[model samples]
Target: TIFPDDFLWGGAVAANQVEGAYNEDGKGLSVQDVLPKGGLGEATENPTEDNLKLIGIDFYHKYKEDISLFSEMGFNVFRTSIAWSRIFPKGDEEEPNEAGLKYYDELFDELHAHGIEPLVTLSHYETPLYLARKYHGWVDRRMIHFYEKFARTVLERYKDKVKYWLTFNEVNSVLELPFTSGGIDIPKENLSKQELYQAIHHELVASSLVTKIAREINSEFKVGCMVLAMPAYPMTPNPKDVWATHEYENLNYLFSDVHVRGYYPNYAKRYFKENDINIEFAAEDAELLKNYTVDFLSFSYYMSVTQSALPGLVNPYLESSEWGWQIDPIGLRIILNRYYDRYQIPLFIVENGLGAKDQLIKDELNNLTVQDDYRIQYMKEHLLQVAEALQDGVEIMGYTSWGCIDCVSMSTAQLSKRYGLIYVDRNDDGSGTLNRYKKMSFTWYKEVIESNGESLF
Candidate 1:
């Protein structure tokens, strides 16, 4: 209950997951529009299915209603991303869209009207499919030029309304799922390490570039690199497993290092050399990265995985979610301690929750509601760990639970796997009226926020 008076307690969602005005408002198609399940694992392109998951909770039109619900929860900060295509239509546009810009204006205004601050992400789970196709994603250096323009335009346009900005959502997850993360043109199987690392280099440069522009545009702006934070727990205490886990963990930390410290660690250079990976850094990239590191660190933590000296190891201490993601609330505390020790900056848990097949049934008064005690317990345990981290003297910014309202799942490619304090009436097959109902956790979280983190009891 030692949470600060100004702590940002809210929930988070990405544009691709929630905003469903796909072909409306001159918005162009995103890579998510055409991408199929198991991207790069087994690939298929659905050119005609542009009408797919983009209908996410219809947040594009339902944002006002959603914000009301958010305000009811006493949210001081609401986190979400701006759909890039909504702004530029296509990635390389000389002029921006008026309608797209206006939509966010309305959104930010609504959030502010309710005394809530908006935490905006520049890019969340997409590239303009056109950019991915024409430029082969970030594999081409020219992608940075386009991205920089987009960043500058948005930053300048909404500079006053928004203060907290995230450069890329789950910025480190690119290597794990490049198509969804990078929106690359080629499949992951055919993509070599050199090309993948090069693409990442471009993204890192873009992230640092955005940070610089954010400062130049507004001194009050705080820009952070968002990543997927899943601490690697060594399956055993063996020296080899511990060392391997350390090195494995470093692979993720490498992203934050470049974002925070503004230079590549020496281990990466050796790895690049050993792997015959010669990264072609531009002339100014060194100075650019070194000079403009991120202001803070933010990440999504739904679960943690096990690492081992031998392959395919499982954690004996963990339980797996229905989706197979291993739950580890204690991992949150471990990461808070370790990341705070390493970076010594403000940390934000932008995304953390359980994705389960929630059912909608009538509650005591025959009102539509979801019991979602599992969700409450999941969140309660996580917050208790957050309280532990706070008591341990870690300076955390706040926690914004992921998919605060049910949106389409990025990983599952369906609506069945839901994670929200509010339930959406829409189903996976795209049936039902777009009605909104508060789940049991809704009042639970409202109390948690009103009490300023004291309602864990």
Candidate 2:
């Protein structure tokens, strides 16, 4: 096997996209609750019933079953988020919600019982709505205090049970989807650049601070930051296109740069000055970041978009998914090499999967399953490149493919855009038995994990 003996194999998911007991067990409404249409459309002033995520495959009650399925797939590890709203109900609450705390206690215990390590992301996108509403999310700078409380509460509770931790889910994504990523109540169009950048600075500082806290609680915990890693290729050989790609890439890279190096890179300083994006920071922010740099870097890779200096360019060589995301396995190799070259720490591919309208069919054996060879192909191609990157001497921690089980999507919020090795019997129209069925990819992945990438070929 080309994969190292300790290479972790698993799948990734977020709570807002999976856990469904939205208003149950003292759970408070999150920023996700307001988005009736998920991340693709305007957020509703209040959560509407139509949001498919309200009953997100009923994972809240069915986690034991789900974990068994993951174990059946021979997962060495499982990646999931601790929903902030579940614990705090409101962002600034001093007392933690005991029900929310116990739910994860059981969830982690179940995974451990199955001999699978849990890679926990402390705060995914489901920010408690109270904070987003009152303080405009991270814009007020007080968010740092709330986040530290949230991180500390969980880290102290789970320090002994969990080993791997991520501060935020796709931290760089905050720039594009301010509301979804940073819980900023202000609409993206109405947001000021200074406000957005300042909010980002707050998150970076908070992320660093969490690293410091995690180490204080338990030195064995491996703390890392997650970013949305999309490599932008120049659409032409022209220097302008190349330069355009550089500027675009640098901004996205800025998040991980601060996490790994504990300081902003030169390109970020130049870009901020050129754009007059004067960001305010606390007096101790820089020192916190410099000293509490992450132990590793992790990112979510989906597709690579092309760049043009003149604007409006698409990749000519790549075919796109239904959502118009370019399918680029080679781009995976490019990013793995690029990130490892830039940051020498171990890297984890936290989220990567193709979303498609899967057709569930009963085979000759009368078993319900998705013959999603397309998904298996997608994973194989991506993993092959991962193997190549390993051969190139890039130290990778693990590969937790996203949407391990069917759940609500971030972009469109449609359940039809399925990406799961385990199929959930739910739909966009909210009709189904909420049953679980193994897809063909489940058996394939089991073999791949069992053989440790040797079966991938």
Candidate 3:
């Protein structure tokens, strides 16, 4: 492996996904707290059940300890998001929460103590519950202005502490769970294509607006657009299966094109044309989107999906998680090469990991540890492919493995799908003592980061 001397190597986690103080410190309710846990697609679609309660593994109070463990792994960069609800209780609130703002200041100071650079994502999956229910989530254009306000507020506050900024976490994932983030849930009742595109239009405008704000705040800060990089593989060599690749590409790259290229792609135009979707845009919306291109491209590559032209062809190698995301590490390399060739910008592998069942094993020293060899293998294969891609001339800026420590699984909404090199033993019922244990991969990752790719292979 031939990575640069300063190549960034670390793991990533999200605030809402790890920080378990749902309503603490003047923070209002977030949609993630109310949604039900477990089962893919069901959690986001239905939110009245008081399910998926994210009160387990309280990282809010344990960040110092967590960051210390991250430092032990020799993480040069730590990627996490700020909860929107924490900063602004409601999305439209006139005043910000001082306590919520102070919490991050202290957290960053602790990470800085250990010589870790913070990679901040402006917006993760958790949005203020007030805005999701009241403002209709990203359907109306007004949400765009509100989001920009939040972006600017955080950028100014943490301008000196944070340099690598991501505009959104998996901005393309909103397309998959539009009801949750895209503000199309209410309008989705009628299932109109026009309604979905309308929601997408609002999100695109919001992303573009924030991109402009980020650049103006500090030229040193790099604002990257994040996406879920689940490249679609054809189930067979059939023509239709090959064609389905275009559909998958269009679905994934539509948001990226709008953010990175600063406009909709040809496929997006064709999608609107065929669906009879007329996106009602303001005069400045197009100009804003076109002018405010992102500084870099970032993505979360957890798993991949296989598309088949034959209706009955079952995917033999569809490796899945407890939450049912089919694993495809090679697809990561494919997407990276494809996007790098198209965009010609530095790329960030923001998120990639396996969510699996982990068990605590006591060593001879009477220390609790997790034997996560599967995680080691999963990461090794991905990094090997990443090495191949870099060798072929992809300008990759960094790589951050997802869920550096076990906290909460986004897909399953449960704590069982452990993705971290450090194991946190708090369960869904919030019963266990919040204990963090280093897994087998911890030492492996420490060496990888310390060597800066010189010893990764």
Candidate 4:
């Protein structure tokens, strides 16, 4: 089988998720700091006031060595995000922190020196603490201006180094956890569905405005939106359940359609109308969206869901991560076919990997190291489908496995849910040497990339 000569193969890490210098480099407080030291179910309601600390693997100081490890594994791309607090100190600030901006500049420069393409997500879940506190996250429409300011600042600052960018990380996930990811954590009053849709509208406008900014600043730069591509499965074959599953699942499409198609889907419009929620939009918002449709689609594919009418009828066939996120490698092919058929634009699998309890097995041939055959198999099945997608003429830009090295799980906030081909021995209790060791998958991924993905079955 023929493969693209220039397939990009690498690993991914997010600043807040991986880089532990939460308080370093002129940085202000962030929502991640206050997140409860536990699982997603146990995530802090007051991530602002809570003092849950985050001084994990220390990538801020060790990025150079980490990238060197990635290069040794034959990476051509490295995915990471810029911490909003790192750049803006406060999300509303007009001027950014020079030190924070300089940190990324050097980070990207080092990656460039190593021939790694910097695929950047402008704002991962890590937004500045002040923004969430002051503006109630995107609840206040004024955030568009601050977001655009930050977006433009980074775009112009690193336009030469970074070409592929995502406006937000798992944007739909933010909509799901408005308090945690959306930056709106208020006590007492529950946020209404209408209010949530309104918050989403503000982000969509901000993303559209940024896309326009990137286009004007550099045509070569491609701005895409990142979404958690967890397609819903019906609880049962019952018509009501199936329809409900599909209807609710349309919410996932709202993010991509608004950016790619430049307008809200009819179902979304009906949803707003039925809910009696009239969304406020600026006069230029539609024009901006139309003018700045994202150049490509980028999403994270982790697992699939199977829905059935009888609760007991639904049996999970695939294994799940430690966090209970089911493992369904076939979901990659399902989503790729669905999204590509809809938009027909280039796509990138910006994040995907197994988050499991990995045991370090010492190989006499390779010495003591992390033996992660499970991760290798998980990646292999997904990549094979991705290869199949390529065979079917889908334009996939690259595949960057999530957490090239050890990083905290976004959902559970546990270090034990290891995802990297390279393993870090730190656990949930924060014990262990911050040692980086190659897993069995390290050689497998290197050869896959070296062969331009042709060797994958």
Point to the candidate with the largest TM-score. Answer: 2
Cα RMSD to native, each candidate? 1.6, 1.3, 2.6, 2.6
Best by lDDT: 2
List candidate 1 segments past 4 Å from native. 36-51
Model 3: per-residue Cα lDDT over 1-457, one tens digit each: 4887677888888887888777688888777766665324444543443353556467888888888899988988999989888988887888788898899999988988998999998887777877878876777677787788888888889999999988777654554566555534464456576766777777778878887887788878888888777677787788898897668677777888888888778777778898898889899999999999888999888666777655423467757655566667777788889899889999999988887778888978888898777788788888888888888899998998888988676666778778889988877655677788889889888878887766656
Arranged by lDDT, best first: 2, 1, 4, 3
When summed lDDT is taken over every stretch of 10 residues in candidate 1, the lowest stretch is 35-44
- Model 2 regions lying over 4 Å from their true place: 322-324
Worst 10 residues of 3 by lDDT: 38-47
Instruction: Please give, for residues 1-457, the per-residue lDDT of candidate 1 as tens digits.
Output: 4898879999999898888878899999888777544243333464444333567688988889999999999999999989899888888889999899999999999999999999999988768888887888888888898889888999999999999999988665678777778877676779888988888999999998888888999999999888778788777899998888888887788788898899998788888887788889899999999999988999888767778888536778887776677778899999888889999999999999888888999998999999988889889999999999999999899999889999887775677788999999887777889899999999999999999998775
lDDT of 3 at 13: 87
**Per-residue alpha-carbon lDDT of candidate 2 for residues 53-151, written as tens digits (9 for 90 to 100):** 788888899999999999988998999999999999997887999999999999999999999999999888888999988988877789989999999
Winner on lDDT between 2 and 4 is 2
- What value of lDDT does candidate 4 attain over all alpha carbons? 0.80
On the 0 to 100 scale, the lDDT of residue 267 in model 2 is 82
Q: lDDT for each of the candidates?
A: 0.86, 0.89, 0.79, 0.80
Candidate 1: pairs in clash: none
TM-score list, all predictions: 0.96, 0.97, 0.93, 0.93
